[PDB]
């Protein structure tokens, strides 16, 4: 795991990527690590934003599955050809697997102009794979064909990171790991059973927090909350920070807020605690997020020279998404073998002058199942 430490590059803004090699002889690509999707899909044609792409026909081990795939989003898509090839992770375990690969032949609003990655490693489960759940996701192939344990953990830093494949590295976190159950193997779905701001219960029905699901998603920048929860949260963060006025635009992620370099008044901004369903009946634990995780610094803007931040909490269309902004505070263990997700304070988390992040428990929370939306 020493050899996997620091094997990710990038930021929460454009995502985190891992080097992979596909085919024979090996072709080296940077691949977004995305726990909110389940396809392994790589640029396979010279889209102008791409540094590198997959040239199937130069791989002696490529096998055309003679089947297309099509994945749409709200305002875009990617599209391509399914096949299999030999895959590896230079700074991963010392194995080669034959995996399903979607050779992206055409796409729209998918690749980010200026990014240094060319594909997507969908680490979530087969149920949300495209074109259907019979397209075995990458991690499933890795585990089936090798003795690599069926887990991985992510330490996302910035504001790069590490993906430890096959276990847990003690040196990437402090304190103890607490585990929340994966509710259904599709997205990494979890249950938020309670939310607090500076220790103050947000006081809503916990079904609101998971309406219609809550997921851990390294392919999303922000903490995203459902509409009602988002409004409750912002009102409360306004209240804790009412000694200053901010434009409405700020709370909508449209405008920055700046202070004289070094004078950002962090104390004004509250810690958010999300309680997660525990492994034991009526037991939960809490993860504590600090303002320096949801106030994301904004660098050279037009031409900026102060200290400036945008609000990295946003409204959710499809439930609570624990994006990179949240994951960046923690070492997140995706224990697929035991249907569970572990959190511990990250060794690389941004500290704050007077407050320290935490993962802690146990708490008693009755009727936690009822926080699940059905
Ligand atoms: C922080 O990770 C990202 C930041 N910016 C863009 C992406 C990105 C780009 C293209 C496709 C995808 C697919 N995955 C999504 C998309 C939307 C929401 N969640 C996920 N997992 C991500 C990831």
How is the chain split into domains, by residue range? 16-148, 149-374
CATH assignment of 16-148? 2.40.70.10
Name 239's Cβ contacts closer than 8 Å, sequence gap at least 6.
Answer: none
Name 175's Cβ contacts closer than 8 Å, sequence gap at least 6.
Answer: 344, 345, 358, 359, 360
Q: Which atom of ligand 1 is nearest to the CA of 12?
A: 1
Q: How many whole angstroms from 331 Cα to the centroid of ligand 1?
A: 20
| Ramachandran quadrant class, 82 (left: phi over 0; alpha: psi -120 to 50; beta: rest) | beta
For 287-310, the DSSP string reads EEE-HHHHEEE--SSSS--SEEEE
Does residue 312 have a cis bond before it (omega within 30 degrees)?
Answer: no
Q: Which atom of ligand 1 is nearest to the CA of 78?
A: 11
Domain 149-374 in CATH 3.10.580.10? The answer is no
Distance of alpha carbon 122 from alpha carbon 54, whole angstroms: 17
35 lines ligand 1 (CB under 6 A): no
Q: How many whole angstroms from 234 Cα to the centroid of ligand 1?
A: 24
* Residue 240, φ and ψ in degrees, nearest 5: -60, -30
Q: What technique solved it?
A: X-ray
b vs e for 236-262, b when ≥16 Cβ sit within 10 Å of the residue's Cβ?
A: bbeebbeeeeeeeebbebeebbeeeee
Rounded-to-10 torsion of CA 357, 363, 367, 371: 0
Distance of alpha carbon 280 from alpha carbon 289, whole angstroms: 23
Q: Considering only CA atoms, which of 95, 127, 132, 315 is closest in space to residue 227? A: 315
219 lines ligand 1 (CB under 6 A): yes
Q: Classify burial at 185, counting beta carbons within 10 Å of its beta carbon; exposed 0-12, middle 13-18, buried 19 or more.
A: middle
Q: Considering only CA atoms, which of 250, 230, 352, 351 is closest in space to residue 298? A: 250
Q: Is 28 helix (H, G, I), strand (E, B) or coil?
A: strand
Does residue 332 have a cis bond before it (omega within 30 degrees)?
Answer: no
Mark out the alpha helices in 76-219 (DSSP H runs). 138-145
Does the annotation mark 205 as catalytic? no
Does the annotation mark 217 as catalytic? yes
Q: Which atom of ligand 1 is nearest to the CA of 35?
A: 21
CB 94 within 8 A of CB 88: no
Reported as half-sphere exposure (CB side, CA atoms, 13 A), residue 352 has a value of 22
Q: Classify burial at 170, counting beta carbons within 10 Å of its beta carbon; exposed 0-12, middle 13-18, buried 19 or more.
A: exposed
Tell me if domain 16-148 and domain 149-374 are identical in fold.
Answer: yes
Residue nearest to atom 23 of ligand 1 (CA): 219
Q: Which one from 34, 85, 140, 335 is the annotated catalytic residue?
A: 34
**Test site for ligand 1: of 13, 34, 47, 222, most ligand atoms within 8 A of the Cβ:** 34
Q: What is the resolution of this structure in A?
A: 2.5
Distance of alpha carbon 51 from alpha carbon 194, whole angstroms: 44
CB 267 within 8 A of CB 352: no
């Amino acid at each position: 795991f020493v050899e996997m430490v620091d094997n990710l590059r990038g930021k929460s803004g454009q995502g985190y990527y891992v080097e992979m090699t596909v085919g024979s002889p090996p072709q080296t690509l940077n691949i977004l690590v995305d726990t909110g999707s389940s396809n392994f899909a790589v640029g396979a044609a010279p889209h102008p934003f791409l540094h590198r792409y997959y040239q199937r026909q130069l791989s002696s081990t490529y096998r055309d599955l003679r089947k297309g795939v099509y994945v749409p989003y709200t305002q875009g898509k990617w599209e391509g050809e399914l096949g299999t090839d030999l895959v590896s992770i230079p700074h991963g375990p010392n194995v080669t697997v034959r995996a399903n690969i979607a050779a992206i032949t055409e796409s729209d609003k998918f690749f980010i102009n200026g990014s240094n990655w060319e594909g997507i490693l969908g680490l979530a489960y087969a149920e949300i794979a495209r074109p259907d759940d019979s397209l075995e996701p990458f991690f499933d192939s890795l585990v089936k064909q090798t003795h690599v344990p069926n887990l991985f953990s992510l330490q996302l830093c910035g504001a790069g990171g590490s993906m430890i494949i096959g276990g847990i590295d003690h040196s990437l976190y402090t304190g103890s790991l607490w585990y929340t159950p994966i509710r259904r193997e599709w997205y990494y779905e979890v249950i938020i059973v309670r939310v607090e701001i500076n220790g103050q219960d947000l006081k809503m029905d916990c079904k609101e927090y998971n309406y219609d699901k809550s997921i851990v998603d390294s392919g999303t920048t922000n903490l995203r909350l459902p509409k009602k929860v988002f409004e409750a949260a912002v009102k409360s963060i306004k209240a804790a920070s009412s000694t200053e006025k901010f434009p409405d635009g700020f709370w909508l992620g449209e405008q920055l807020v700046c202070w004289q370099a070094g004078t950002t008044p962090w104390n004004i901004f509250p810690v958010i605690s999300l309680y997660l369903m525990g492994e034991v009946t009526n037991q939960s634990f809490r993860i504590t997020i600090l303002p320096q995780q949801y106030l994301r610094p904004v660098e050279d803007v037009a031409t900026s020279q102060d200290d400036c931040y945008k609000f990295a909490i946003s409204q959710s269309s499809t439930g609570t998404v624990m994006g990179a902004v949240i994951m960046e505070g923690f070492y997140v263990v995706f224990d697929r073998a035991r249907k569970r997700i572990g959190f511990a304070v990250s060794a690389c988390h941004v500290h704050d002058e007077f407050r320290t992040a935490a993962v802690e428990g146990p708490f008693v929370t009755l009727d936690m199942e009822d926080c699940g939306y059905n």
